[PDB]
Amino acid sequence: EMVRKCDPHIGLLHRGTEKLIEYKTYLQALPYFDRLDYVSMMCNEQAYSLAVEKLLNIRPPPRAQWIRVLFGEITRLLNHIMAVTTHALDIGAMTPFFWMFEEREKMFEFYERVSGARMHAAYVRPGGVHQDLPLGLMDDIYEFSKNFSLRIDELEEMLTNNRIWRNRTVDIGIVTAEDALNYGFSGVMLRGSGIQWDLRKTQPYDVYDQVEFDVPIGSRGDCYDRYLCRVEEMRQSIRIISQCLNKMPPGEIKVDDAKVSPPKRAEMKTSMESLIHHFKLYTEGYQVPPGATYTAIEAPKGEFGVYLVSDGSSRPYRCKIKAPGFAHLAGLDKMSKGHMLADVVAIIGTQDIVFGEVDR
Amino acid sequence: MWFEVLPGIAVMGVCLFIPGMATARIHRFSNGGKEKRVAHYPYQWYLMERDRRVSGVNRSYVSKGLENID
Amino acid sequence: MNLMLALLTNFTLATLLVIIAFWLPQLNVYSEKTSPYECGFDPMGSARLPFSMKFFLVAITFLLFDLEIALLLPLPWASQTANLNTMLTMALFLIILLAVSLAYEWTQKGLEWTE
Amino acid sequence: EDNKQFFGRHRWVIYTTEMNGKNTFWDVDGSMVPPEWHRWLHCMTDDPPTVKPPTARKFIWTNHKFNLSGTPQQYVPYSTTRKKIQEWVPPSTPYK
Amino acid sequence: TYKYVNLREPSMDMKSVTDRAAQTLLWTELIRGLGMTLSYLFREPATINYPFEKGPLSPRFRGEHALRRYPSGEERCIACKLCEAVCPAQAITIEAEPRADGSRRTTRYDIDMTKCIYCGFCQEACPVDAIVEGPNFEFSTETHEELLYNKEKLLNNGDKWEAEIAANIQADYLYR
Amino acid sequence: GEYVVAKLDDLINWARRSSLWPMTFGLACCAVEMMHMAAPRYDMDRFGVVFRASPRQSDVMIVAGTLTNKMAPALRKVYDQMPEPRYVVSMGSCANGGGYYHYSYSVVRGCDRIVPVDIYVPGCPPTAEALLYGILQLQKKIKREKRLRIWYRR
Amino acid sequence: ASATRFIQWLRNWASGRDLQAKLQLRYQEISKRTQPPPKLPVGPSHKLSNNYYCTRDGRREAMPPSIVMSSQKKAVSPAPPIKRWELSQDEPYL
Amino acid sequence: MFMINILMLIIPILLAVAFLTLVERKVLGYMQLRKGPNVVGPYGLLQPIADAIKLFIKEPLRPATSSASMFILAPIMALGLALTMWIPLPMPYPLINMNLGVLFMLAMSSLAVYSILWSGWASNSKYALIGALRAVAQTISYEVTLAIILLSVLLMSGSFTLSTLITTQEQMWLILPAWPLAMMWFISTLAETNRAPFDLTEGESELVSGFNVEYAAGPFALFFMAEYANIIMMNIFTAILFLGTSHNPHMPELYTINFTIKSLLLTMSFLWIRASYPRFRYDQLMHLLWKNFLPLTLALCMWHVSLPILTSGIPPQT
Ligand SMILES: CCCCCCCCCCCCCCCCCC(=O)OC[C@H](COP(=O)([O-])OCC[N+](C)(C)C)OC(=O)CCCCCCCCCCCCCCCCC
Ligand SMILES: CCCCCCCCCCCCCCCCCC(=O)OC[C@H](COP(=O)(O)OCCN)OC(=O)CCCCCCCCCCCCCCCCC
């Protein structure tokens, strides 16, 4: 049962997403980003929106930026619940999956209430967000967040001090700090080994410079430390969410520039300019000045970026998608040296892999 | 609620009760209303065989008392 | 007799269940259905190829430890001896030598699986 | 309804035993809920149609139909456009 | 700022050492874990009683499509084809011509529901609120062909669900 | 004659639909909503629906996600390795007809080019409740089987 | 919420917490499913004067890249070295 | 009247096993904040029947590469030996009263291991083989410790007769003088029954289904029935070994009631443990037994040899 070589064969979920995007307008291509890391939908939307906003040279309004950070951290909670509980489920601890997927179910209701969809919201767009938060949503998000830390505590009461859990994770898949960098790792795959790096702190986007939170840091670079980093990241997400709820500003939700963001329906049905711009934005779409940007965010799984090429038209010329799981999986053979079959099962979980983003 | 698990436990409990009850009752029925004789050692078997001869009906569980002493 | 009757009934019931299981259901047999399973892709080599044992040294030591129980299982009867002075010395002697053998293999890394 | 129950179990429907000719004593499905009650049952609103009825229109179905898949009433797709090219129809008399 | 998740050196006083020996030998932290699942055993489960109980939805929910009408009964769709242009999945197919009264109306309106991504872009693009995604999510079928909707199917959906569709649009149009 | 086989269908049908074991088989996004159907709110297990990893011990295949050309031979393989009777539920637009990758060079335009499909669950993804509606629709399909009635009249 | 006092006590003792204060099932503390209508604000460009689009056109202020070198003194780094992170005062050791 | 007695033993066992599967699914459901079966019959009471009927009308498969005779033989041994483990159990009267009932169960339990080895081997598939060799590893881990743990307990009972354990515990449960052994015995029974956290020969998340991955329909059911019959039997044995129920010869049913409750609760704890812990790595199971339980079991064996002698508490041979 000792593993002598891991050869990950991927492409079983390769769906030519990047080639398909070239045949779409910039708006039409936005839903493709929900279906990459399909556990972190709204964060993928944010990364693509920032790239298009950067190429357009426009700025989303302050309220949209706060809604983006709010739902980005709600999205981070959804990811880490899926990451930790399915990681535990593979290692044999099935119960936490059930307790914490009832929380995931309530966070899907927030997605559905703002966008009408539980998962592929298509809510974050270049220029802001699609719609404003419905009245009374922020109260319900506060009610959920009031109780969530207790759920994390029950999760830790089952795993953190458990000797069986620690035996299955401690000193498993150790990765040195230098190897992680040269292998292209990011996110918790760096911080687990002690590398102090978090794109929300070092290369902040939206309103991340206006919230306080701590970056968890590991000391042994193994599965257990990455597990503890992810759990502590969930606690810091709640800490950020509390700030977004309290500091939400008033105002519009998409850039007040109708050559990029569509007008309100009432305006479109009254004003000639609004109708023309609505008509043109939903047929041709907005043209983007020629250029190329690599734009990245601290997605829940790691650094998620797009290299986006514009030829001046309303359709992207090239859209290369950078998925953090691509480089993490490429290091699976390196991380599994000297381990057994059951350890590789754990090392796959500790990398937190979704093959929608890996294969695209 | 959690007490909706009780019906399946009771049915499981009743099934596990039957083997012990049946064996106790079948032993008494086939041993003249008494416990089945236990013969772990040659001595006990020897006495049991002697009772079968003494019974006069070839049954070690048919007992003979003072009325068989003239 | 009773024991032989009981064993025959147990394995007779099990065989009857297998017989019923094989002749009651409607069958549709073809090559792909009966091909060896391996997660959707064809097996790469024979499952009869050698499968290395990493705990081979523990497995042999089990044979030697698994005979200590035969020597120790008579202890409840031996406790009824008149010569308890000799008993207890010899019973403790065997268990200690078994403990020493375990310590030796432990300290010499015999219980570590080979990589 | 029972507002002491936790959110999600505080509303429920006991389906009829017969609907549109079908015996539904054992066979029930969510598609039997008519749209006016569908809104209230799924908590898209707080007011039942008894208190806040829907707006009446002469084209709205007066009879709700459940899922008709797998029955002789199932929808069958077809093209709704007329013939595009018209063929030449030869004469009915012989001249040749 | 940053914090350490696992960088604590345990104390080496005989009481602390004896506490950990008890933990190793008496399984106290594994017993403690048993307490948690015992507590859950006596909690009310979160399961709803579907299909008699339904999960909560919002007026924005994106479900089955339907073509709507004006109160007079006239169709709202004017064959502008904005929905067909924006559809990320190319799930919409339209043909139009002047109606017998000169009105601009469609003669084909297909949605391939196995192409559609239920994204709602079509109802954003529509300038007359003709095509919408209604609240119905329980329309699974036994054949693929049943999911290829033509205009007759979608108009029937509009008439079927209009009572609910109108009330949901009334509750959310001020956010649009 | 007719009465006995009529009851016998009711019994074998009741057992088969009350004990439906899907293969532990998910492909992409839609497998996440399949998880949410196993989660406490919907609890598929309460209907008698239990995931089992081995194809040999599975009755239903839920095709939950996009089927690529690279994956297609593997999906057909594990389907063939289910014992009969077996059922296929096609979940989501990708499985139903290729969906949003319908025009891709690497995607199978509907899993029904590879396997027979009993039920098509629409959506991208279908909600967990919509999938539960599809599973219960599959149960009612099984309730209508007439295997012995047809056998009797052969 | 309907659990008896004995059962409330039992699952509190077993878990070691006060589970009742933070129930995971939602009751009537959630928002009502029928809300009053909103009246959403408008953006900065909703003015009747001093609002010419050519003064607020971001796309038209985008310019092609600056050619630094084309093949057609102190050493520098790409940016100043990153400052070393400071430990949290909220909770430095988990 | 003996054939009737045999049927009064094995038919209830198969019914108890059937409803143990329901109780497991419900107990894990509520510990997982859900409900478990409650549709098929009231409170899911008809679920085990539906599952039983469904499997036995499902198509069995003979894998192309498999060894036919051993493939079919293996499930028959599994169920046959699982039922044989019950014939010596005093409840309070055994079906078969053996002098050496304790050693008979040790021998049968060793033989039941081969129903795993041969099913995994005969399958001629890699996941089946990997599961089978985990069974070899698991037996090596617990067998030596299990026998010596029993020997220490029997040094207070003085006999290998299972019924003598009832007499030994007439004034007090043996768990008082031997809770360190009861702890290691309870773990050993989890390993012996391939139960979580030691469910390694099947190990769903690693081996798909392990040793019986190629089994379907009825032949699969026999393995599943054998597993759950072994769960109950080993908890009855634990109850008899450490929680002796007083026996009144004139009211033997009262023994059977108290005795059954203890066995149910011990079986419930197996389900409780399954819901609580992750799975061991199978080389960590070997080290747990050999490096922890074995040194302590060897020491307690010497202690329990000496203790009756030094306290003058040696039991009788009868
Ligand atoms: C814990 C133990 C639990 C055991 C549970 C056992 C099940 C109890 C419930 C039994 C109800 C009857 C089950 C019938 C299912 C038959 C499978 C089926 O559906 O096939 C459809 C077939 C119909 O096939 P068909 O003729 O229509 O067409 C088949 C060809 N193709 C595939 C092309 C269509 O049913 C039959 O052929 C006959 C039905 C028999 C029903 C009565 C059972 C008698 C079977 C005796 C078989 C002879 C060997 C003896 C076996 C030992 C029997 C005890
Ligand atoms: C007068 C003189 C007296 C002389 C005699 C005195 C003796 C008294 C002191 C004896 C010691 C008492 C403890 C004996 C039990 C065995 C203890 C033990 O073995 O624990 C260690 C073992 C390994 O733990 P670990 O930390 O990983 O390994 C050491 C690190 N190198 O830990 C484990 O075993 C891990 C087990 C994991 C699986 C647990 C799953 C079940 C847990 C719940 C069960 C609770 C107990 C149930 C008991 C039932 C009894 C019927």
Ligand SMILES: CCCCCCCCCCCCO[C@@H]1O[C@H](CO)[C@@H](O[C@H]2O[C@H](CO)[C@@H](O)[C@H](O)[C@H]2O)[C@H](O)[C@H]1O
């Ligand atoms: C590497 C080799 C290791 C070898 C280790 C061997 C360890 C053996 C230790 C001695 C064990 C027996 O120790 C001895 O037991 C007997 C009891 O049976 C005691 O004897 C005592 O009880 C017996 C009967 O029980 C009386 O007849 C006697 O009058 C009394 O002295 C001895 O006082 C004690 O010294």
Ligand SMILES: CCCCCCCCCCCCO[C@@H]1O[C@H](CO)[C@@H](O[C@H]2O[C@H](CO)[C@@H](O)[C@H](O)[C@H]2O)[C@H](O)[C@H]1O
């Ligand atoms: C009379 C019966 C009771 C007496 C006990 C009999 C068994 C004694 C077992 C051997 C004890 C000493 O021998 C043993 O040798 C190894 C060397 O590899 C030591 O050291 C090793 O053990 C542990 C666990 O394997 C490792 O974490 C450690 O890294 C390693 O150095 C052990 O700490 C020591 O326990």
Ligand code: SF4
């Ligand atoms: S919801 Fe989206 S994919 Fe579906 S028809 Fe409308 S625009 Fe096209």
Ligand code: SF4
């Ligand atoms: S449905 Fe609306 S957007 Fe589509 S063609 Fe008709 S009017 Fe235009």
Ligand code: SF4
């Ligand atoms: S149907 Fe939708 S949710 Fe499902 S896999 Fe395809 S894109 Fe993802």
